[PDB]
Design an enzyme around this catalytic site. Sequence first.
Site, PDB file in Angstrom:
ATOM      1  N   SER A  62      42.164  37.448  34.060  1.00  0.00           N
ATOM      2  CA  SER A  62      42.184  37.759  35.489  1.00  0.00           C
ATOM      3  C   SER A  62      41.876  36.571  36.399  1.00  0.00           C
ATOM      4  O   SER A  62      41.912  36.741  37.627  1.00  0.00           O
ATOM      5  CB  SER A  62      41.201  38.879  35.826  1.00  0.00           C
ATOM      6  OG  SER A  62      41.505  40.081  35.157  1.00  0.00           O
ATOM      7  N   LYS A  65      44.580  36.039  38.810  1.00  0.00           N
ATOM      8  CA  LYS A  65      44.595  36.647  40.133  1.00  0.00           C
ATOM      9  C   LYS A  65      44.313  35.650  41.249  1.00  0.00           C
ATOM     10  O   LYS A  65      44.656  35.921  42.402  1.00  0.00           O
ATOM     11  CB  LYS A  65      43.588  37.794  40.197  1.00  0.00           C
ATOM     12  CG  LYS A  65      43.951  39.008  39.319  1.00  0.00           C
ATOM     13  CD  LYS A  65      42.817  40.030  39.334  1.00  0.00           C
ATOM     14  CE  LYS A  65      43.122  41.300  38.543  1.00  0.00           C
ATOM     15  NZ  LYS A  65      43.174  41.096  37.067  1.00  0.00           N
ATOM     16  N   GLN A 118      44.083  49.524  34.735  1.00  0.00           N
ATOM     17  CA  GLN A 118      45.205  49.054  33.933  1.00  0.00           C
ATOM     18  C   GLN A 118      46.463  49.853  34.252  1.00  0.00           C
ATOM     19  O   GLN A 118      46.403  51.077  34.438  1.00  0.00           O
ATOM     20  CB  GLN A 118      44.898  49.174  32.441  1.00  0.00           C
ATOM     21  CG  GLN A 118      43.604  48.499  32.011  1.00  0.00           C
ATOM     22  CD  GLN A 118      43.757  47.000  31.854  1.00  0.00           C
ATOM     23  OE1 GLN A 118      44.836  46.450  32.060  1.00  0.00           O
ATOM     24  NE2 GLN A 118      42.678  46.331  31.473  1.00  0.00           N
ATOM     25  N   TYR A 148      38.474  47.547  41.667  1.00  0.00           N
ATOM     26  CA  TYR A 148      39.152  46.445  41.008  1.00  0.00           C
ATOM     27  C   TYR A 148      40.191  46.960  40.016  1.00  0.00           C
ATOM     28  O   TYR A 148      39.899  47.821  39.183  1.00  0.00           O
ATOM     29  CB  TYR A 148      38.102  45.589  40.307  1.00  0.00           C
ATOM     30  CG  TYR A 148      38.640  44.414  39.525  1.00  0.00           C
ATOM     31  CD1 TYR A 148      38.913  43.208  40.166  1.00  0.00           C
ATOM     32  CD2 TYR A 148      38.828  44.489  38.150  1.00  0.00           C
ATOM     33  CE1 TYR A 148      39.369  42.127  39.476  1.00  0.00           C
ATOM     34  CE2 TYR A 148      39.300  43.389  37.439  1.00  0.00           C
ATOM     35  CZ  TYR A 148      39.557  42.218  38.113  1.00  0.00           C
ATOM     36  OH  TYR A 148      40.014  41.114  37.450  1.00  0.00           O
ATOM     37  N   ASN A 150      44.156  45.929  37.984  1.00  0.00           N
ATOM     38  CA  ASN A 150      45.393  45.191  37.750  1.00  0.00           C
ATOM     39  C   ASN A 150      46.581  45.842  38.441  1.00  0.00           C
ATOM     40  O   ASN A 150      47.435  45.147  39.000  1.00  0.00           O
ATOM     41  CB  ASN A 150      45.679  45.090  36.259  1.00  0.00           C
ATOM     42  CG  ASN A 150      44.625  44.313  35.527  1.00  0.00           C
ATOM     43  OD1 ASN A 150      44.254  43.221  35.941  1.00  0.00           O
ATOM     44  ND2 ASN A 150      44.121  44.880  34.444  1.00  0.00           N
ATOM     45  N   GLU A 270      36.697  35.907  44.928  1.00  0.00           N
ATOM     46  CA  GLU A 270      35.585  36.654  45.501  1.00  0.00           C
ATOM     47  C   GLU A 270      34.492  35.690  45.954  1.00  0.00           C
ATOM     48  O   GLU A 270      34.327  34.603  45.388  1.00  0.00           O
ATOM     49  CB  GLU A 270      35.027  37.658  44.478  1.00  0.00           C
ATOM     50  CG  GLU A 270      36.110  38.549  43.897  1.00  0.00           C
ATOM     51  CD  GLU A 270      35.621  39.416  42.772  1.00  0.00           C
ATOM     52  OE1 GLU A 270      34.390  39.488  42.579  1.00  0.00           O
ATOM     53  OE2 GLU A 270      36.465  40.026  42.078  1.00  0.00           O
ATOM     54  N   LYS A 313      35.593  33.696  40.099  1.00  0.00           N
ATOM     55  CA  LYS A 313      36.405  34.741  39.490  1.00  0.00           C
ATOM     56  C   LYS A 313      36.182  34.707  37.983  1.00  0.00           C
ATOM     57  O   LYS A 313      36.245  33.639  37.372  1.00  0.00           O
ATOM     58  CB  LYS A 313      37.896  34.555  39.838  1.00  0.00           C
ATOM     59  CG  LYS A 313      38.815  35.688  39.374  1.00  0.00           C
ATOM     60  CD  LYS A 313      38.563  36.961  40.173  1.00  0.00           C
ATOM     61  CE  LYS A 313      39.237  38.178  39.545  1.00  0.00           C
ATOM     62  NZ  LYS A 313      38.517  38.685  38.341  1.00  0.00           N
ATOM     63  N   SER A 316      39.376  37.655  31.621  1.00  0.00           N
ATOM     64  CA  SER A 316      39.363  37.857  30.182  1.00  0.00           C
ATOM     65  C   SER A 316      40.707  38.397  29.722  1.00  0.00           C
ATOM     66  O   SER A 316      41.478  38.958  30.503  1.00  0.00           O
ATOM     67  CB  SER A 316      38.232  38.812  29.739  1.00  0.00           C
ATOM     68  OG  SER A 316      37.006  38.522  30.396  1.00  0.00           O
TER      69      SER A 316
END
Length: 359
Positions: A62, A65, A118, A148, A150, A270, A313, A316
């Site tokens: 991530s 992102k 997900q 949060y 995906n 963030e 950020k 994983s």
Amino acid sequence: KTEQQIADIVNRTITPLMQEQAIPGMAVAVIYQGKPYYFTWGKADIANNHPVTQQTLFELGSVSKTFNGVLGGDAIARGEIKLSDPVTKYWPELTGKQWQGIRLLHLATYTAGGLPLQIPDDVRDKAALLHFYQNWQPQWTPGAKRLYANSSIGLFGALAVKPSGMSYEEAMTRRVLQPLKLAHTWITVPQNEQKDYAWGYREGKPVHVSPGQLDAEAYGVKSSVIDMARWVQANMDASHVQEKTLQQGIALAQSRYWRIGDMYQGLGWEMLNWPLKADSIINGSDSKVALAALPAVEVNPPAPAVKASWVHKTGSTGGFGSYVAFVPEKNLGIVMLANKSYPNPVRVEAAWRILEKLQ
């Protein structure tokens, strides 16, 4: 501080981390007073005994992102999109009342109303993805809660590149990767770079992230420690990024669009106000909190990037754990690439203990 002092702090923290977490291979870059210092330990490939090098490609998870957020901010600066635009401007087939009030803003900042963490793995083609979104039902009104996900920021990235006429990967390559000279950063790893592509390890077995819908936008970037060193410094200070829209989009990804307790939602990135207590960052990274649906307070207009921020950020995959954090006020930052997943609170611990000694 010297290279010797930096190295000492880095190694004193990383070596027992890799022993206790059983991390086979690790690459770390420290940004100290604006300049990178690199470190590598262990193996990228255990069975074949390939060491980690400064060319080793790591699955960012991530952290992908943040590239999304920057590519999106680029699209904003080019006037191609505005986060206030409705999703149906970019995917008109999402007819149906629950999508009527949802803007690109909500997708980008996870505030759409409960899009799931997900995309379901039985959603594997274009027809099913559209059906999935068409039929998803929200739990809150747009902009009430941050969850949060995906499926949320992943879709924002897929839609934000539509004006460009380019696919996500080609837009990413042409507008972000090539301008920042990130020549060892990939959404798909070409065959001639597979030899540098580390293996992640999950329960002692070598693994690589699986294909999935919108993986590129959400968790499917691979990069080396040098490219991620360049990444951090570009986001920390893009005053020398010569492409005007990219330098602007880097900055907009660090605008504060929402406040959620003591953290602020950028675009992928963030932020927390600096200085701060370490327990704030560490406890905030526990998935008990970070995966929770929390009340979102809109910042309107979005507050411009605040140089006294801890910007970070976690990322994983099944077999990799990454973390990037930097503090623009001090020109200080870190990237930690590992080919084993390990707890976010532990990543934040090691980052803070390195950066606290380099203030």
